[PDB]
Symmetry: D2
């Protein structure tokens, strides 16, 4: 069941959120957000900058003072508030899914059944951690009692991208709030609207003022101001590898804030000759084309063993040609537009690059519609490792298929990347599966599946794909500051 | 390489060990221990009874008093003492290997390369845990600081069997001493000698008196005295399922001491049609015949898929016929005698029942020598689930081969047992391996291997094969008593 | 802040609950449950016996079959169901609190603000554990991949007492359900009604049939049938130390089911001369008198340092003389009746013994009303260690005050008990608090507080006060069966 | 007992250590290391630069290749190698203690009994972790088996300071080697010799070539080359806050390597009026003066409650005047020289600054010898928060005493610092201890003690004092890269 969408949802929230209230930018500036299916302006949104970030950081710091409501609140009650926020997002699920589709472009059926479902599951998962992330009592040498407190890291700056706007918001707020931190969040200028509506729900859930503050605006202004802020304790950034470097340098040049990064990839999807062909073709299609190709972990190097290459490619081209591109509010649509004009042009540039460098264009390759930013599902065959389209993240509906012979060969080729976000293996053989999952240098390895995210299992990069992990128990580590307390006692005994 | 044995090692320790000193039994009684290869008496051993156990418990209780050297010792220093014990065992490795073979019957090459290596690894593993099994600091509601102390459970009665005398001693002492407990250990009357020599090494290593006390004697006397003792806090028993019942009843009927049990099995070893045949045949042979068949977790129901049954049986019979039975000090010997007359007779009884009930005797079936408790490697084919030899633990060199058709069928048959210690699956297929390891109701499931013990991984029974786990971090749980301390504080903050 | 009670709440559920349906007993027998405030029968309740337990166990076993809805359910969804159950209990809170008071006797204000609050908090806490109790991946020696699965123990028999009927139900259901077990629960004949209403809510919440079955009935019949059942995998019993023995013997005598026990106490509450006097007096009052004295962990030996003894006693008597005993539906009432006539007589017997043995009766000592089971708050002074009232659990409103001189003396006297459920220390001094919390042989030590329970912190006995722990992460341990899977791999690498 | 030192120990190792071999610098340059007790050159040491770092990184990367001896080694065997290294250090303890004193200046008795004891304890502690840092099996939604592998982060650059040369080496090597990483270590130019001798012992112990590589040289050359290297996966730096910034920027500007930092402090030691005076005076002296004042966590703001100020100061000055400064090989010597002329001058600079800004010079204040870098124990009274000597890390034998009135005052003044490495509280009151340990913003809070390091408890800074933790289980986190493996299965069951 998917409820019929409101195809022109009303916008209620379009300002800066600080201390549970809505503010214009100090400059009074606004910027337009565009509906990528039509190329039309949806509305204007407050354009936050350094001075607005400063206000937000001050508010968050005040909310974090010893003795404040948020610091004194029982950990279990932090869990109750996360569960209440999830209930309110569920109340407003049909609205939020439609607004997500309007601002981002992804199909409404997918916003509804996938993104919003995952948001609810992420928040509810982290609600349960709030009162369970224990410190330790430690049997130190000597006449002492030693223990650790797991305290919050403090004021957390969180910068999120446009590809999964609500889900990325949840992946950040869940662990940070479960562990009693306070947040200054910068949302993507391409997709600010759904995160701002969720701020209304944060207020309605009962979170104290200043615990979550959201500043819409641009990267070099608002994002940079968070990264360089002298009173932000920790930054978590999801976005390009290039900007990740900018964030880590900003941290080191300012106050030595702690940093985690979730960046791009060029993830390999390895199809052994003993794979289930029908399932491997469908899953390789999903692995690449999911979310208009705008997935950090997209399976954008599809390695296929030579004895099954021709058949796999024939089936993959047929499936790409059948993929329905169109109005994301139409239930038949499998692929909406790309998020914006900038991305649209970049993907057209990468398609031309693949043609220029001699990849075999097997289908697509062009613009799919007049209005908006729609690109045909595009498949390149006989891709070679030295090709730019085999090295660089394209972030669009452009599939690369490579041929290989041996399992030893494919490990080396899959690992010969400065990225390392994810990888997958399709095989029926126990030993091939264990060989490859061990050898692949990637933060997640899927076996006979792809893009299986669970709030319970961590996700993040090796190499230039990131540092730190999100989701799972691991997602709490970056949000905790550990204090050892070591007390002299009269006589220690076991 | 294996250093040459002394085939007639001198015995230095044959008394009751209490407070790091050697005692005759109060009664002055002694019992003989016999070399099963010859049937001849090795020496007399002090025959401990209730009054000797009471002496040992009082010594243990004194060593456990708050403020004692053992209670005040740094946890890291307990680790140092376990490491020193291991080094002394390593120094005396050839002696202990030869003594183990003399008293138990197992081949000297195996005592040396397997049993003594596993002992060293177990003690060294647990030495590492001594100062790492942390309690918790807990974010309880209200204005409180709450934490747990992991304290020792106290005076631990440990009753160990004769099949792996040194290794079982180490599996019990490692976790108990790492966590700061004190021990009263009852060793098997068939194989008391190696454990008593290790007590001498415990003294040499510098453990405080009373921390380990060892009482040789019989079960209905010394074992029962431990199980019913009013000042023993915890009992751990490895032995038959039948005597396990006696232990749990004695705990309930005395002081509600905590109980863990490692009991018998009738473990299924499932060979799918896609298994590597050479490896599956060799591993199924090992699985059944290891240690003269005297292993809790022996793979004593070998289920073989019907398409490979005839070949598997032919190869298995050839391998059993080649198995060399002989003097356990001869380097060529694969199989020594059974441990004693009682076992010898029980096994010959089971072989008779297998013949009577219409299982197909394919090789062996009788005594293997005119002196010593030696039994021919015996294989029965066409075994059916209702046969005595398919249901009861035989604990000797008697293999059962059963035919099956489907994966669903074999799960039901494998699980239709009141035992659940171990199981194994041989297959190349990822999904079959995952299906079966999930579905089998056993404490350990091996995939494409058997009898792979590691000090790092827990072991123990489902159903009537026992309760609790030994080895790994889990092996510490039963040796810990948890104390919560909850302290009023002026104002709790995150 | 308390809604007015319905003082004559209607009873909707009074039968056996199996497969989400209501059943008469096979015998068609019923038993009365009485309102202890009046001595009058509230209603009849189905009298479950062995045959009813057998129906319940079969239903639970079917629900636990591999591939069943409950076995296949996502762990996170078990959490959702526990949260839904909590929401339903919250919807029905005013009703449940009144029904609890009617059947048990405790003041409605306390049923509402304490028992129901704790129930909600326990279930919501364990909802969060459902998808977080991870097994391990383990770096075993050799070319292997080794891991553990945390599986459910299976069919869990749960026997709960009458003192906190709803809370004890929650303490048992929360961890068992979080970990995917199925339950056969026997509730106390004195207080069956609220647990049966909760069963209706379990159905309403969506739990699959057979996952929770409740058999009301007597101990020697229904409870013994559970303890001895050949297809119950685990039993958890809360009640007297005497019946705890019977349970452990039944487990040993039947199928070696796993056992945990929460039993009685005679917990010491130690007041040092440097304690805050007013806080100590009020907390010592609470420690003993809470819940009509019907608390496992009641502070029933109040040790008071000699320098403050007279003042402490004078203040303690003033408070006992002014504690209001009355209709539990009246908001002024601090103390309701005892649960039944048996307990009423037993407590009066203990008061008689206290006087005969030479303790100083300082107030109370007799019946408090002409109908219902009301006893005057009673304080004995100059109590000595060897007196019956200093040794045996009274379980009523009878306070023992003992004088001591030194901290070393009081440790020894406090620990000279076969009980060890809880203890407390009142002092301003850091070293005295740490000295005593370490030295006291009790499962919970409170410092400057008493009866502080939190779902996050474990609770249970040393010595003959029980084995195992409830609440916290520890509360999951007894509901988990650990399986090791060890898989041959081509080549293990770090 | 302390063995007689060789007061002029010979030097055997003074080159670059790569692949278990000794190399001159590619440039053939050497630099002098000086004995700070005399100002004289001990020997020349190879002057490693970028080319030498590149050689060491390539060696480490090769040793880390899948299938290498170090990658394939059992985790338990990594533990055995750490234990062997510890045994070799213990063999050579008298030598290494004297060499440490020669090159660093600290008293031989302290090198022997404190530094070397702690080195052995750190290595032995981490040996025990090698096979115990488990990944997880995770109950993800859907028909999947999901688990994590804890893999090594890879090639680890480790840059260590001169204050505790051997102990800082052990703090770095223990966790890195326990978890399977490989190391390129840069040692301080002031104190390279003991670390290079330990490299000989690493070879002797049997670590594969390339697993530990050590490059002596300068910071702007060798250190920077490590921080900026494109194939170093992780850097750990201990040193000044200033250079920490440099390291973090290099990581961001190069390859996004993971960073941890242990930086300086200005740690507050708070003496409440109810402290034990004699203990507080002795411990405040140790807190400041230990190791010639050259300790990251030195108690360099001694806050003393006004009611005990005059007495505490009188006793502190008497203790400082009694402190014996001299030849660190003489058994009576409590304080040796400062490490080098640069530090000697900088500390004298701060003393002058203190006198000029109006702190009261109570004793000391100048040079203590005319040869070698010896400074008188110096105590300033009536210090105020805004003074340079109250704000900047002096890293010498210069004590600051500040007066305060209230507990809220002292918390706020202690926390008004951009440092937060450590703090201490001296009080007999339970509530004051708990109030302060919670409220102080520091990575370690000691109560009634100071400088209590245990390999079991983590250490690290808040704020500008660092990020990440060393020691304990926490010290392994920065050395682990987490991989999630998520496998499709036929039917997931609990
Ligand atoms: Na948009
Ligand atoms: Na024998
Ligand atoms: Na030097």
């Amino acid at each position: 069941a998917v409820p019929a969408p409101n195809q022109q949802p009303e916008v209620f929230c379009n300002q800066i959120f600080i201390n549970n209230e809505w503010h214009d930018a100090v400059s009074r500036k606004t910027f337009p957000t565009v509906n990528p299916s039509t190329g039309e302006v949806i509305c204007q949104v407050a354009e936050g900058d350094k001075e607005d970030v400063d206000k937000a950081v001050k508010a968050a710091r005040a909310a974090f003072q010893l003795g404040s409501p948020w610091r004194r609140m029982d950990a279990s009650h932090r869990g109750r508030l996360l569960n209440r926020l999830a209930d309110l997002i569920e109340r407003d699920r049909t609205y939020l899914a439609a607004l997500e589709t309007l601002d981002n472009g992804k199909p409404y059926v997918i916003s509804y059944l996938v993104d919003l479902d995952m948001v609810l599951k992420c928040l509810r998962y982290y609600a349960g951690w709030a009162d369970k992330y224990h410190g330790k009592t430690i049997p130190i040498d000597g006449d002492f009692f030693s223990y650790t407190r797991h305290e919050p890291v403090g004021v957390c700056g969180q910068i999120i991208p446009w590809n999964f706007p609500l889900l990325m918001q949840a992946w950040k707020l869940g662990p940070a709030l479960a562990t009693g931190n306070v947040v200054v969040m910068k949302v993507a200028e391409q997709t600010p609207l759904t995160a701002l509506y969720v701020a209304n729900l944060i207020k309605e859930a009962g979170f104290p003022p200043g615990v979550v503050n959201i500043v819409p605006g641009f990267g070099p202004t608002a994002g940079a101001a968070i990264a360089s802020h002298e009173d932000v304790d920790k930054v978590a950034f999801t976005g390009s590898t290039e900007i990740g470097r900018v964030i880590q340098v900003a941290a080191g040049s300012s106050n030595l804030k702690r940093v985690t990064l979730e960046l791009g990839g060029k993830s390999p999807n390895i199809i052994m000759s003993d794979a289930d062909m029908d399932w491997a073709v469908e899953q390789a299609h999903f692995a690449l084309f999911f979310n208009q190709g705008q997935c950090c972990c997209a399976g954008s190097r599809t390695f296929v063993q030579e004895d099954i290459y021709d058949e796999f490619v024939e089936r993959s081209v047929a499936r790409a040609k059948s993929r329905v591109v169109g109005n994301p509010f139409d239930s038949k649509t499998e692929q909406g537009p790309q998020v914006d004009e900038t991305q649209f042009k970049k993907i057209l540039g990468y398609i031309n690059t693949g043609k220029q460098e001699g990849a075999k264009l097997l289908c697509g390759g062009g613009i799919a519609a007049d209005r908006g930013y729609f690109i045909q599902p595009t498949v390149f065959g006989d891709v070679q490792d030295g090709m730019t389209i085999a090295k660089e993240e394209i972030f669009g509906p452009v599939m690369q298929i490579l041929k290989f012979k041996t399992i030893e060969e494919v490990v080396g080729r899959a690992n010969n990347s400065t990225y390392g976000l994810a990888a997958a293996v399709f095989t029926k053989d126990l030993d091939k599966a264990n060989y490859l999952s061990q050898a692949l240098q990637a933060g997640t390895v899927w076996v006979n599946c792809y893009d299986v995210f669970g709030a319970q299992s961590p996700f993040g990069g090796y190499k230039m794909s990131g540092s730190g992990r999100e989701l799972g128990e691991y997602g709490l580590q970056a949000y905790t500051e550990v204090k050892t307390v070591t007390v002299k006692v009269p006589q220690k005994n076991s």
